[PDB]
């Protein structure tokens, strides 16, 4: 089932990110350290500890020397791993950041807090560039589409939003600016997690319902099409497998599980003895995962 390629022992892992063509990974942690691995050559390259307390937040830019953190501390920072330095701050958070994602193209970072808000940032002007309201409990997670102006986000306040934000596109990067498209509700406890199908108008979510619940948004709605039960705690993360037609996601109750979307398959369950887990991430171009747990990362594949 999951063969194991590299493991670290660490503090809890918070967050993750693969480099789209090093073989290194990023992760954040809960003591506010951001350590960068190449998993080929087994080895610590650098460690960042500028932050004060967890840092949820962590993402490459897919073609930038640049990586972004958010932070407890409510601050986002933007890094330059050739550089090995912070390159500047950005403020404006009020309480804990949960995620930073760079926007694959646009000079743009997207984040998440549990100030109920989600912010774009341009890194270019190195300001906030809008703030999207609506959610009324804690952003759990905030991800652009990687091909349309859209962002879906999960919140404590038991709902998934898709938010439409071709508006912001037009005014910021021209030489109202977001709009909630779908209140996507299902979920009956707080959602910790959302993402978009690579190539289908398809989101995945993870809430402490224990539930993974799988949607889909046409030009006019967006409804559930299925829910895989098993976890029996807090569903922490899911990621959609990029290239297979398979659903990851991992759970304070210790597990990783692979769902079979075909459903040709029955779940597979990976347990690890003592560590809960946190966080999930896929590889943007292999077939290549990581999970991050309370006593650090696993990059594994399936088999």
Same mark, same amino acid.
């Given at each position: 089932?999951?063969?194991?390629?590299?493991?670290?022992?660490?503090?809890?892992?918070?967050?993750?990110?693969?480099?789209?063509?090093?073989?290194?990974?990023?992760?954040?942690?809960?003591?506010?350290?951001?350590?960068?691995?190449?998993?080929?050559?087994?080895?610590?390259?650098?460690?960042?500890?500028?932050?004060?307390?967890?840092?949820?937040?962590?993402?490459?830019?897919?073609?930038?020397?640049?990586?972004?953190?958010?932070?407890?501390?409510?601050?986002?920072?933007?890094?330059?791993?050739?550089?090995? /330095?912070? *390159?500047?701050?950005? *403020?404006?958070?009020?309480?804990?950041?949960?995620?930073?994602?760079?926007?694959?193209?646009?000079?743009?970072? *997207?984040?998440?807090?549990?100030?109920?808000?989600?912010?774009?940032? @341009?890194?270019?002007?190195?300001?906030?560039?809008?703030?999207?309201?609506?959610?009324?409990?804690?952003?759990?997670?905030?991800?652009?589409?990687?091909?349309?102006?859209?962002?879906?986000?999960?919140?404590?306040?038991?709902?998934? /939003?898709?938010?439409?934000?071709?508006?912001? /596109?037009?005014?910021?990067?021209?030489?109202?600016?977001?709009?909630?498209?779908?209140?996507?509700?299902?979920?009956?406890?707080?959602?910790?997690?959302?993402?978009?199908?690579?190539?289908?108008?398809?989101?995945?979510?993870?809430?402490?319902?224990?539930?993974?619940?799988?949607?889909?948004? @046409?030009?006019?709605?967006?409804?559930?099409?299925?829910?895989?039960?098993?976890?029996?705690?807090?569903?922490?993360?899911?990621?959609?497998?990029?290239?297979?037609?398979?659903?990851?996601?991992?759970?304070?109750?210790?597990?990783?599980?692979?769902?079979?979307?075909?459903?040709?398959?029955?779940?597979?369950?990976?347990?690890?003895?003592?560590?809960?887990?946190?966080?999930?991430?896929?590889?943007?171009?292999?077939?290549?995962?990581?999970?991050?747990?309370?006593?650090?990362?696993?990059?594994?594949?399936?088999?």
């Amino acid at each position: 089932g999951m063969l194991t390629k590299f493991e670290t022992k660490s503090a809890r892992v918070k967050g993750l990110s693969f480099h789209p063509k090093r073989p290194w990974i990023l992760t954040s942690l809960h003591n506010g350290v951001i350590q960068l691995w190449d998993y080929r050559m087994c080895t610590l390259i650098d460690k960042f500890d500028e932050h004060d307390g967890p840092v949820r937040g962590i993402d490459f830019h897919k073609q930038q020397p640049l990586f972004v953190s958010g932070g407890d501390d409510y601050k986002i920072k933007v890094w330059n791993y050739k550089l090995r /330095r912070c *390159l500047f701050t950005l *403020l404006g958070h009020l309480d804990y950041i949960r995620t930073t994602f760079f926007h694959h193209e646009y000079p743009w970072i *997207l984040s998440a807090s549990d100030d109920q808000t989600i912010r774009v940032w @341009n890194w270019q002007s190195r300001t906030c560039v809008c703030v999207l309201t609506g959610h009324n409990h804690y952003v759990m997670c905030a991800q652009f589409h990687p091909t349309e102006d859209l962002v879906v986000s999960a919140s404590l306040d038991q709902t998934v /939003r898709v938010w439409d934000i071709s508006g912001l /596109r037009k005014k910021n990067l021209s030489p109202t600016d977001a709009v909630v498209k779908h209140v996507l509700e299902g979920h009956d406890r707080g959602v910790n997690w959302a993402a978009f199908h690579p190539t289908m108008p398809l989101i995945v979510s993870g809430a402490d319902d224990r539930q993974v619940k799988i949607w889909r948004m @046409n030009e006019s709605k967006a409804w559930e099409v299925d829910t895989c039960r098993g976890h029996y705690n807090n569903v922490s993360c899911a990621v959609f497998h990029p290239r297979q037609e398979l659903i990851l996601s991992n759970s304070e109750d210790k597990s990783i599980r692979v769902w079979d979307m075909s459903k040709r398959t029955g779940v597979q369950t990976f347990r690890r003895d003592h560590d809960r887990f946190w966080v999930l991430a896929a590889h943007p171009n292999l077939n290549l995962f990581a999970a991050g747990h309370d006593g650090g990362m696993i990059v594994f594949k399936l088999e």
